[PDB]
């Protein structure tokens, strides 16, 4: 169908308990997501440790717009279009740098302060009796009003539509606090490199998989079954190779995944693992445990280490894993192309073993060379191809559907419930159609 300027057709794609395949396959819908969905939502753009000093910047892209995220001279984070006020040149090339006291366009050298405002124009008398002063360009670079941070995690929203930051995320931000609290100094810094894994599928398949407890015992059987076989008849408390530790539980009974639980939020956020874990001696690092107690005391340390949220989804473009200090950023490219960038943090003040474990995890699970990553990409590409079939054009999201869930709010539910996915497409429809 022609979805442009056709919100009724968009609404018809999303029912309470299933969604239409065009969400995954339609390039037109992808284009409209850039204009509406991704422009009307809050999206992660970077971490403060990547731009700690005045003049530091990183480049990024959100909803098809090229951005600069920069530290201004007042210590604040500002976000703006990487698009000169004159004829649209990127002001900065490459992924990061420091621009000192001003951006300088590399085509004709108009300059801009680090808040985006126009600073100087060469040969400015050439505009003396022109209407330049009446145009938006005279202000400088287009700046984003909607720029917020939580515990160093920076998010932006392009448009004026949709919930503001605090309402958008609610208490889901607590997962970020837990990851930073695991530093004995309460601070995270980006470290260890970025695994950049191109996926030939729609971004939605990656995000759904983060809440998908019915896939691991199927899609990871060859990887996990192999791992289990090379760790046979061992004491349960004997330290395991991390590959065995991480792969073997993919084959757990369904009851294990059901019991783990999911919490869902308005606007599609979620986390898996709703329980508190008791901190045991299994694979403990005494110097780290000591440093935690020294900083926080016994009771608060147990609270911090006891949070057991296996993953958290900051819909639509970020997921984090608290206890391992790994994050994954979703970079949609087209209806059938998504880049996943997987980053890690050092826990400031922790012994080096902690970053060793986190960087090992990042390699094992999230590299383009990871067999677990191959497993899930294969499943996504299988759906990306299969969904072109006709006849049944619907993607079933019926598992554990109950209309009581339509009230929204925070909901804690069984771990195999497809609720987080249903919730996400309710948010998607709203954010799509509100600006059409």
């Amino acid at each position: 169908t022609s979805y442009r300027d056709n919100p009724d057709a968009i609404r018809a794609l999303v029912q309470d308990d299933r969604v239409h395949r065009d969400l995954y396959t339609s390039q037109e819908l992808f284009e409209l997501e850039q204009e509406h969905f991704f422009a009307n939502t809050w999206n992660y753009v970077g971490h403060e440790s990547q731009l700690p000093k005045p003049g530091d910047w990183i480049s990024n892209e959100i909803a098809g717009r090229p951005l600069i995220v920069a530290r201004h001279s007042d210590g604040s984070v500002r976000a703006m279009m990487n698009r000169c006020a004159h004829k649209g040149s990127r002001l900065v090339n490459g992924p990061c740098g420091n621009t000192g006291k001003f951006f300088r366009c590399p085509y004709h050298a108009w300059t801009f302060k680090t808040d985006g405002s126009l600073l100087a124009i060469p040969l400015k008398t050439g505009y003396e009796n022109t209407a330049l002063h009446e145009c938006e360009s005279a202000k400088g670079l287009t700046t984003l009003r909607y720029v917020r941070s939580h515990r160093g995690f920076i998010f932006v929203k392009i448009s004026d539509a949709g919930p503001d930051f605090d309402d958008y995320f609610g208490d889901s931000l607590s997962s970020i606090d837990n990851m930073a609290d695991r530093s004995p100094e309460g601070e995270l810094e980006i470290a260890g490199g970025c695994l950049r894994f191109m996926h030939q599928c729609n971004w939605k398949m990656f995000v759904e998989n983060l809440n998908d407890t019915m896939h691991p015992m199927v899609a990871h059987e060859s990887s996990a079954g192999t791992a289990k076989r090379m760790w046979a008849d061992k004491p349960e408390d004997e330290p395991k190779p991390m590959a065995v530790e991480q792969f073997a539980p993919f084959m757990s009974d369904y009851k294990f995944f059901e019991d783990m639980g999911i919490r869902t939020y308005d606007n599609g956020h979620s986390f898996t693992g709703v329980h508190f874990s008791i901190h045991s001696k299994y694979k403990a690092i005494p110097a780290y445990d000591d440093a935690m107690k020294a900083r926080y005391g016994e009771a608060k340390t147990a609270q911090i280490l006891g949070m057991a949220r296996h993953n958290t989804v900051y819909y639509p473009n970020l997921t984090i894993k608290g206890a391992i200090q790994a994050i994954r950023v979703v970079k949609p490219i087209s209806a059938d192309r998504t880049l996943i960038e997987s980053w890690t943090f050092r826990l400031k003040g922790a012994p080096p073993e902690l970053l060793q474990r986190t960087t090992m995890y990042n390699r094992l699970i999230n590299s383009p060379f990871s067999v677990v990553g191959h497993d899930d990409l294969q499943a996504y590409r299988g759906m990306q191809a299969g969904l072109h079939a006709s006849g049944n054009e619907w993607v079933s999201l019926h598992r554990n559907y109950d209309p009581s869930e339509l009230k929204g709010g925070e909901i804690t539910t069984g771990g195999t419930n497809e609720l987080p996915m249903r919730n996400q497409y309710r948010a998607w429809v709203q954010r799509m159609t509100e600006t059409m």
């Binding site: 950049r196 390699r363 067999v371 191959h374 294969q378």
Partner: protein, 158 residues
């Protein structure tokens, strides 16, 4: 009694084993404590404090090899195939007394699956030693030109 040509012959044959699916014989070329290392960034310092694409000990190499035999390795349906093209290995270090040898070998690596194909270029560093009269690898380091770029799935062994 090790010659420079035996060192070169070793690296050439190692790639030939990989291209002919002789993975068990390949794995036996490593010492039991060796690592197979594909760094993530150029001039990466080590495989302990920085992420890599691969930093595989004997257990991880065996896991990956055995998984390729599984009827439910869905990501290898149909199986991928690879090809290595090598520039002649260059001997950087020849220490017979210390039983230590280091070679540097440029490569073009192709991996295909069905009608899809990708290629990668880079340089190998092989650390070789003699154990029980036979050459073995104590480290294979694979420096890809574009290690830190956006890569699709790489499923065989470079």
């Amino acid at each position: 009694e090790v010659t420079r040509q035996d060192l070169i012959d070793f690296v050439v044959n190692e790639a030939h084993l990989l291209d002919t699916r002789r993975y068990e014989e390949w794995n036996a070329l490593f010492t039991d404590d060796a690592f197979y290392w594909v760094p993530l960034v150029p001039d990466q310092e080590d495989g302990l404090n920085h992420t890599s694409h691969l930093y595989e000990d004997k257990l991880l190499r065996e896991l990956r090899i055995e998984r390729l035999k599984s009827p439910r390795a869905f990501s290898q349906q149909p199986p991928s195939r690879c090809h290595h093209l090598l520039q002649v290995p260059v001997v950087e270090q020849f220490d017979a007394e210390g039983n230590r040898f280091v070679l540097r070998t440029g490569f073009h690596y192709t991996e295909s699956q069905g009608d899809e194909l990708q290629f990668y270029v880079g340089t190998f560093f092989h650390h070789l030693t003699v154990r029980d009269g036979a050459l073995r690898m104590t480290l294979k380091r694979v420096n890809l030109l574009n290690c830190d770029a956006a890569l699709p799935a790489v499923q065989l062994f470079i």
